[model samples]
Target: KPKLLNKFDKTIKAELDAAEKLRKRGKIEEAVNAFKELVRKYPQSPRARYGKAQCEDDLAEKRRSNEVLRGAIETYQEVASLPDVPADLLKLSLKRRSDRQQFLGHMRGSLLTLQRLVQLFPNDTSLKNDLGVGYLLIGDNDNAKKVYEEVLSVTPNDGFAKVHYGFILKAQNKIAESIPYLKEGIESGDPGTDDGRFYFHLGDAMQRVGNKEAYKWYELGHKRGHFASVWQRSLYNVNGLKAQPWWTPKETGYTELVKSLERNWKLIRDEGLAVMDKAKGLFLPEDENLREKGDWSQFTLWQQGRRNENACKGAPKTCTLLEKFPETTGCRRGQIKYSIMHPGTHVWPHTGPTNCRLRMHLGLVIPKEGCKIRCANETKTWEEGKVLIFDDSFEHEVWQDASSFRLIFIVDVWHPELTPQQRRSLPAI
Candidate 1:
């Protein structure tokens, strides 16, 4: 009786080993047949069932069919639910099942599976991260954030948690607060943390803060073949503008428009001064940042795609010149104003919210040497009667150190490459 039982055990082991070898050798159909026969012969064998489930999963992945994936997921779930299954095999089966659920957009099911797994393996940081990702996929950002925070508290060196938490904060518009965490995660030297997605998030945070350092991160992410980085880099490369530090009238396709303005410079300047004189009390800082410190003010003639009829009435020549450039006048969020920078004023480096528009500065009364504008990396003084066109989406700053105030006629035009249809599609801000 003992010899017969030993022979039976050897036969079962041989069949299971052969099935696994076939699976390992990529002969999935033969492997599945062997596993199926073994599973039928030894109905209680955990290894036979697990091998069959794994073969199904591999076959489903090879087929790339949704129905086949669903079938594989069901088989994995069955193996995971077996009462006599080993803890390690059951864990792997559940993980594979939940991952397939996520891929099928059944995030609620995935989350439920992960929640149960977390209860069973409370100390597993990877399971917690998987739970957090499941929450994120289901649009439960608050829960996702809480899970990541808990993971970080327990595993302070978890670079994945840090990067994901930083991304959540950035999406919530906590840009300034998210930078340090993202920077640390990118520098963590962990293979799991070194991914294009993290680099893209860091680049976005830096770009929103108007830091030129974003270019390096963006370029790095782009090299890794991240689509968002590719789109962002292309958008920043305005047609004919190419990411240069400063742009000239000749490069922007606005030379004729600039010359037209210069010809009518006297009329426009006089009217601009008239409007400034009339609205001296109304001239306030253009934004809260400038209001707090910088002496940058504007006498507006048009704003937010609407013509200020009263200001236009006061400065008909300026408005007339603006109308000549339909590209600026027709934009959804165009602005024309007499920008006044008082002596000693400094406008800190900042980038525009969108690259859909380019800013044109027609220098009317620039001081000799102290009034200079720095765009990207180049600094140049504005020449009176000449237009300086630049993509304000780049980091730029302005300062007037001369004793006299620096004045320029400012206009916003649609990026030259933008089509009429594209311009029309922009939201009316």
Candidate 2:
């Protein structure tokens, strides 16, 4: 009987080994069936159980490759639930589940899994980056930025974190600040074609600062196949601008826009304060733990300045509530929060996604000194409760007076009233 048991163990071991080889070769279905048979034949063996789980993981991978996200999720869940699953295996299962949820647009569920992943393995930088991405997807820029900050704090040279931080800055319309981080990521690592994207953004930032040399960077980016380079080139051409000479802020239009933002800054700030006060509970809770960690970025989520799935509770209201601007009709952009920059804080330059809409600022709680914003070729001052609106897609930067925190309300508004034809092109509900 002993001899027979030894032979049986050897047979199972050989079968498991073969199954692994098959899996590595991408013959997942066959590998899974082989492991399944082995498990049935040796149900009491721990090794057999482990083999079965591996096969299940392979099956999940296969399902994912086939774009059957739901099926992959179910299989992964089953594998994770098996008794005596290894810790590493459990972590992988969680990641797969999180990915599945993200693909399905289940931002809340994905965030929950990502939070668990972070808790399960706080030291995993890869997980941290992925979690940060999840936050970004859910419009939880504050949380996303916080996560990136934590990563930068621990792994200051992390290329992924640096790139992500650039994304945060860009979203905040601080394109100038974003350029350094993106460039750092590309320069420090063998990032391949990602360098193109980095250079392209740098060109954008340079353009905002009225640097005529921006064209060089954009041309370099185009050579590397960055998609935006194409659009930028066409923009330059259609404007009858000399490509070789690059772009510069020549006309007084830049100054006028600056004055526009300065004039009405207070109105924007006030509106931001009103919205923040109204949606305080949903977006910003004064949780001591969160506050003690110096996580002020999450405040943006409560302000409705960005759209993401994981920002708030409930369906359709996944990230933010877009309040339609009265005059713009179809255009909806505006304030949900106001920020008072404390002394010694400087906001780096950044740009919004596009010029299709404009952002408004109203000065709220201006510190003793003052605050200023630079959008493209213009610079503007903030006034208490006054309104300022400007095209956000251009490059921009900010600096607060040395004496106090710059306080201003942030809001977005649509381009002027849309024509009937434009309204027809709007997306269906």
Candidate 3:
């Protein structure tokens, strides 16, 4: 009997060793076959079942076919259900099964699997976080909030929980209550603290409280490149299904406005040039222009709706023309300026700080082929008396090569998407 047992042990050891070598060598199908034979011979061997499950998982990952993935998930589940499996092996099998289910969009199954795991390993914070996210995915915000709160109770600086809980609060319209949690999450030094969703939620919270600081957070969120669908829709007017290089005014309602500006072009030109001598040349510091040394001369008329006293006093007709346009006057943030691009001038590529406004150029004087503007991907020359509208938030540059100056009536208006309420809510400056 002892001699027979020794021979059986040697046979089983050799089979296991060969199967492991096959798996390591990337011969996954052959490894599966070898492990299956061991399982068939020793039906109750946990090691054999675990090895077969792992081989199936590796094969599934390589193939990435839904059918193969499902097969792997089932194999993992079977291994997890086996009696007398090592504790670590059972936990891994369950986790792999649950994660695959989640990846496949089987949310209900994933939730139940994770719940079981959480019950089995109550101290595992990572499993608890996954379970909470699962609850959130299923729209069970109440339970999700409770789970996150419980997580915070144990681990006060838990970044994921704090961020999720803050989002839940924001969704429930508890903006004031959400702010502290989001701020704490952002400052926690957690790996996920830099996620755009956290900044977006925090910005929304601050905006609701009329804090101007929201703009900074919103800008930071956009820079991070992880926008939520609703947030993207609100900012860009798209459903987050497409991307645009920059946000510009919808052309639908702007035709009449453009026509009005064009029809009054002669008046704009006469009044604009009337103030040329009185206009003070811009003296922007190096930080503002990003230029090296010499004067790349330019000029401004109105800034933030307040006219340069000299220009406005001298060019009453121009100010009156701007006032005649209700759209221009209604958007108090608007600025109307007569910009002169001197000969040999080069305006280096730069982007505007914000997309809340659209820039307009009504070409007053164009030297046939010497001045051109490039915004984002498109470049074009200005035509005298024609209107050119674009988003200055895009990277843009200008070059004036003509011996004469290139002159245009420049204006900035509120972005069309801003509602009356939103316009009023914005900071006056």
Per-residue CA lDDT of model 1 for 1-429, tens digit only, reads 112123334557667778899999998999888888876787666667777878888888888878867877877777756556666766887898899899888999999999988998999999998899889888988999999999999998787888888888987879877888888877785556777667766876776577878777666666765422333332233244244445666777777777887777768777777666776755657775533255888888777677888777778767877776777777666677888888867775555656777788888887887888877667778888877887777657677788887778888877777777877877754
User: Which ranking of candidates, highest lDDT first?
Assistant: 1, 3, 2
* Candidate 2 TM-score to native: 0.46
lDDT of each: 0.75, 0.56, 0.70
Top candidate when judged by TM-score against the true structure: 1
Q: What is candidate 2's lDDT per residue for 1-429, written digit by digit as tens?
A: 112123335656667678778878887778767766775776544444444555665565666553445655655566555555556766777787788788778898888888988987878988999899889888989899999999899989888788778868987888778877876776566333265555656666665556766766666666666533422332111122122211121221233333444555544444444445665443353233212222222244332234433333321221222323232223323333435455544554444443334466656666645567776556777666455666555556666555644555454443333344543454421
User: Regarding lDDT, does 1 or 2 come out ahead?
Assistant: 1
Better of 1 and 2 by TM-score: 1
Which predicted model would earn the best lDDT?
1
* Candidates sorted on TM-score, descending: 1, 3, 2
lDDT of 1: 0.75
Which digits, one per residue and each the tens of the lDDT, describe model 3 over residues 1-429?
112122333557677878878999998999999988887898766667667877887888888777878887887777767556666766787888888898889888888988988998899887888888889878899998889988999998898788888989988979899998898887775775787668767875785576868656655666666442222312332131222333323452466667766888888777666655544444232233334232343345577656676666666666766765545555555567767666766665554545556678889888977789887667888888888887665556678888787778877776776766766766643
- TM-score for each model: 0.54, 0.46, 0.51
Which 10 successive residues of model 3 have the least lDDT summed? 233-242
- lDDT at position 338, candidate 1: 85
